[PDB]
Amino acid sequence: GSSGSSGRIRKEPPVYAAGSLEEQWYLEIVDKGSVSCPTCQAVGRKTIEGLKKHMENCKQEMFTCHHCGKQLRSLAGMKYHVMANHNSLPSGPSSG
Ligand SMILES: [Zn+2]
Ligand SMILES: [Zn+2]
């Protein structure tokens, strides 16, 4: 057996903070209807909740060579494009 009752007002702000990203993304929705990914910025979601899960893994780090300025997802592959194309073996101030 059991019993009980309650009833009070609810005047509190949403999970969002008074100055956080969540709020920003939220607007893009309440204004447009959907929000894009701040990481890839190619695919969005109907709301944040859904996006969060997306960025939870998508959140990756991009790189960009300096010699030429190549852009590759896999750091390894890139770091190799330099030693291959920008192969400057330390020998002398000249080649010949
Ligand atoms: Zn993404
Ligand atoms: Zn390069």
Swiss-Prot record:
Zinc finger (C2H2-type): 63-86
Location of the protein in the cell: Nucleus
Superkingdom field: Eukaryota
Biological role: May be involved in transcriptional regulation.
Family: Belongs to the krueppel C2H2-type zinc-finger protein family.
Protein name stated in the entry: Zinc finger protein 512
Organism: Homo sapiens
Gene: ZNF512
